[PDB]
């Protein structure tokens, strides 16, 4: 997708990784029409070293690894994520991801 | 300031009211070169009825009343708030408030 | 989607209703990112009178009711159905549905 | 005949080899004003090795060898085959062979 | 077909009705891809009154009724008749029917 | 005379050599204002070897040698022959010789 | 034929009626490809009253009636008469009839 | 005088040498305002050898030598001779000499 | 002839009537190709009353009546009279009649 | 004076030397405003040899020598001589000398 | 003659009437080619009343009446008088009468 | 002053030296606003040799030497002299000196 | 800020350092939204040698060091200082600092 | 003088009334080439009521009345006052009065 | 003379009436080529009432009446007076009267 | 000041040095706003040698040295001197110094 889009979710990868539940997001995004049993695996999992890292901080990394792969996708990725998140019921981040346009 | 700016802080008045401490913001914003002992009073305080409302929810309203008045201000209001927040050390919202441009 | 597309699946609604398994199609199309537990219900089911009609001829009607709703959809509907059918492994109808273009 | 025509019957040589009876087609096509006692012989027959191949699969090959020779013909070949097939009463393939135009 | 064609076979309906055998023509023309069991019937037969007319003169009328119906046909009718007659082996009339062009 | 004229009587030298009596033609053509006691002699006669050839086939050759010399003539040759033949009462060949024009 | 031609043979109808023998002319002109057993009759004969007129003067009138009818004819009439007279061996009048041109 | 004039009396030197009396012409032409006692002498006389030639044929030569000298003259020679001959009362040659014009 | 010519011989009708002998002129002018036994009569003679007039003065009048009629003539009249007078050997008046030109 | 003037009196030096009395001219011309006791002397006299010449012919020469000197003069010479001669009462030469103009 | 000429001799009629002898002028001017026995009479004489006037003053008036008549004359009058006076040997007035030009 | 002025008084230095008294002129010209006790001295006097010359002829020379010096002067010299002379009461020379203009 | 601004406060650094109290200015300017605990320190303090300098003259130097740093600032520096001074209640210098514009 | 000048000394009438001694100014300004014993009187004096006003405040008013009258003056008034003040040795106000330009 | 000249001697009629002696001027100006025994009288004298006026003041008036009349004169009046005064040896007023030009 | 100004007071330095009292001028000119205790000293005094020169002639030199220095001055020098002299009450020289303009 465009340049001004990757930069968006890039810097704002914290708010989006915070307000949306990840279970409710991952299982839905794959579910949405984007990634697959393979993609979400590699995204949801990590390098393996992350084990050094305490519990609080692995789910957040995961969730942060998600949007990076979603951004990876085809140009709808915006229109895909905005809707998926419209359903996750994280409207306050759907705005975040959409308002930069218009 | 411009139209596309009021709409920004308008819809995204939750993220900004969340990540930035309000004490550290109010006492700094007034401190910044914007509002005054009078402004911040009327903003920090509310109608009076808010008393019906429990503790959790009055500080959040307050903080949400702040950005509305900041938005009220002169066209720097952007460049004012982005910096004030650069100091509040809520960088993850300074981005939010800035990234919509560029 | 375009006019020359509805006419396509319209007249050629027999070949497409024949070569593709319906189970493998319905459960996949809904699955694909098109219709929903509601859509496929109303499509997979019929008016109710169809009961007059013998077994051979209700599944064929069903399957024929599917493509009509798929055609109903947004302009990808082509690009959606061509791929869904690329997976159903009814390539000899994916061609049918695609070859009219190019 | 044109390029976009050979490609048509080429990829869609299965549907056309399926829905139309071959007897009713061969004896009619030659009969139609296309091939001859010589053509249809060489088309209806094959290399000779096809003997390795079981019954189901030789008539289908034959029938598939027909359209290839029909395609071989002069530019009417379309308008010839569409009509011949209009008579074979395989309308659902006459459509197939025609609908790509218009 | 064109005007200058009907006039041709019109005035020159004697030479063409003379040099070509009619059996070898009728059974071939129908055979050719022009008329049908119905056409050739009505052409080969006549009003019924022709009975007044002696044998010599009914076959000639018949044969003369043929070219009139052939002329009746679609614009190939020229290119159809020239070839059919190329086979009847009445080359000396195929010339007649062709030479007016070029 | 023109090119498209020699080609005419050339290929159609059979019909014209058939329908018109030769006596009634030769004695009239010379008579017409074309050839002379010398021309018609050399045309009506032949090389001398023609003797190998049976009766049926010498008069036909003769008659066929006539039109070749008539064609030889000045540009009226058309308008000359068409009229001469209008008198020979071989109208069905006068047409032949004329209809190629107009 | 043209105007300046009728005027020619008109005024110079004496020289032409004098130098050319009439027998050798009449029997040749008709013979030439101009008039007919009917024309030459009416020309060679006269009204009937000419009987008042002596022998010398009826043949001269006749001969003078000839050129008038020859002039009557089609535009070759010049080119016809000049040649006919080239044969009559009245060259000294063929010149007369030709020299006015060129 | 012009070219097309010398050619006239040149070829038509017989008719003019025939119809006009020579006495009535010579004695008048000189008389007319053209030649002189010297000219007409040399014209009326000849080389001297003409003696070989019989009577009929010397006066005709003479008379034929006249028009040649008249033609020799100045451009009126036409308008001179036409009038002189208008008087000689050989009108039927005055026409001859004039009609080529107009 | 032109205007400036009549005026010439008009005023200068004395010199011309003086230097040229009249016998040698009259008998020559008529002789020249101008007037006739009739003209010269009426010119050479006079009204009849001239009888009142003595001898000296009638020949002079006559001679003066001549040039008036010569002037009367066709446009050569100049070129006619100049030459006639060139012969009369009245050169000193031929000059007179010519010199006004050039 | 002009060229066409010297030529005039030049060729017409006879008429002018004839009709005008010389006494009445010389004594008047000098008298007129042209020549002088010196000019007229040399003109009226001659070379001296003229003595060979008889009386008739010396006065005529003299008189002829006059006009030559008058012509010699300034451009009026025309307008001078025409008037002088208008007085000499040789009007019939004043015309001569004038009429060439106009 | 021109205007600027009459004005000249008009105002300067004293100098010119003074320096030139009148006898030597009158008898010369008439003599010159201007006036006549009649003109000079009427100029040289006067009204008749001049008798009142003494001798000195009548010759001066006379002489003054001369130039007035000379001025009266044709346009040479200048070129006439300048020369006449060039001879009278009144050069000092010839200058007067000429110098106004150039 | 101009050229055409010096030439004037130059040639006409006699009339002007005659009609105007010199005393009345010299004593006035100097008096006028032109020359001076020095100028008029050298003008009124002469070389000294003039003594050879008799009385009549020295005053005239003097007076003639005056106008030469007056002419010598500035461009008014005309307008100066014309007026000075208008006073000297030699009007008949004031005219002389003025009339050449206008 | 602009050039014509630095020159302003530069030359007029005395009036501005005089009329505005420094305490009321420093503590307000820093307070205003310009300098900081660091800036005002280095400005309010000096090199250290200033100790040679008596009391009167160090506060004045200080105050004079202030405006130099204020001038140092961003282009508002004008609009900043004019307002800060509008509050210091040194209006008579706010004018000074503003009036140079407009 | 210009508008932007009156406004200058108008608002900045305090600084200028402060830094320049008035004695040293008044006695110099009048002295300068501006006002007069009359002007400075009316300026230096006041309405008369000023008596209500204490000593401090009358000299200041006076001095303030001065510049108002100086401003009143002709357009040099600037260039006059700037120099006068250059001498008063109030350079720090000469700047004030000048710096607004340039 | 011009306007800017009358104004000159008008206002500067004192200096000119002062520096130039009047005797030496009057007797010279009249003498110069300007006024006359009549002019200078009326100028040098006055109305008659001037008698009221003492001696000092009548000569000055006189002298002042002079230049007024000199100014009255023709356009040289400048060039006349400047020179006259160049001689009066009042150079310091000749300058006055001249310097206004150039 | 301009060129045409220095030349003015230059040549007319006598009239101006005469009519204006010097005391009343010097003490006023310096007084005027031009020179100074230094200028007027050096102008009012001289080289020192002037002592050779008698009293009458030193004050005049002085006064003449003044205008030279006044001329020296800035371009008003005209407008300065004209007014200063308007006060000196030497109006008759103020005119002198002004009238050269306008």
From Swiss-Prot, chains A, B, C, D, E, F, G, H, I, J, K, L, M, N, O, P:
Compartments in which it is found: Cytoplasm
Induction, as annotated: By ecdysone; exposure of salivary glands and midgut isolated from second instar larvae results in a massive increase in levels.
Removed propeptide positions: 1-102
Tissue-specific expression: Ubiquitously expressed in embryos during early stages of development. In late third instar larvae, dramatic up-regulation in salivary glands and midgut before histolysis of these tissues.
Regions crossing the membrane: none
Occurrences of domain CARD (ranges): 55-100
Post-translational modification note: Ubiquitinated by Diap1, leading to its subsequent degradation.
Domain of life: Eukaryota
Subunit structure: Interacts (via residues 114-125) with Diap1 (via BIR 2 domain); binding blocks Dronc-mediated cell death. Can form a stable complex with Drice. Rpr, hid and grim can out-compete Dronc for binding Diap1, therefore removing Diap1-mediated ubiquitination. Interacts (via CARD domain) with Dark (via Dark CARD and WD domains); the interaction stimulates Dark oligomerization to form the apoptosome and brings pairs of Dronc molecules together on the apoptosome to facilitate their dimerization and activation by autocatalytic cleavage. Binding to Dark stimulates apoptosome assembly.
Miscellaneous comment: The promiscuous caspase inhibitor p35 is neither cleaved by Dronc in vitro nor blocks Dronc activity in vivo.
Similarity annotation: Belongs to the peptidase C14A family.
Function: Involved in the activation cascade of caspases responsible for apoptosis execution. Effector of steroid-mediated apoptosis during insect metamorphosis. Overexpression promotes programmed cell death. Interaction with Diap1 is required to suppress Dronc-mediated cell death; via Diap1-mediated ubiquitination of Dronc. Rate-limiting caspase in rpr, grim and hid death pathway. Recruited to the Dark apoptosome, an adapter protein complex that mediates activation of the caspase cascade in programmed cell death initiated by the intrinsic apoptosis pathway.
Protein name: Caspase Dronc
Gene giving rise to this polypeptide: Dronc
Full-sequence range covered: 10 to 111 of 450
């Amino acid at each position: 997708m465009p340049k001004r889009h990757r930069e968006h979710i890039r810097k704002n990868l914290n708010i989006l990784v915070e307000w949306t539940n990840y279970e409710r997001l991952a299982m839905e995004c794959v579910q949405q029409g984007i990634l697959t049993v393979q993609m979400l695996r590699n995204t949801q999992d990590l390098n393996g070293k992350p084990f050094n890292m305490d519990e609080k901080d692995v789910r957040v990394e995961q969730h942060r690894r998600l949007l990076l792969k979603i951004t990876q996708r085809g140009p709808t990725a915006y229109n895909l994520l905005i809707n998926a998140l419209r359903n996750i019921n994280c409207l306050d981040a759907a705005v975040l991801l959409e308002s930069v346009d218009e």
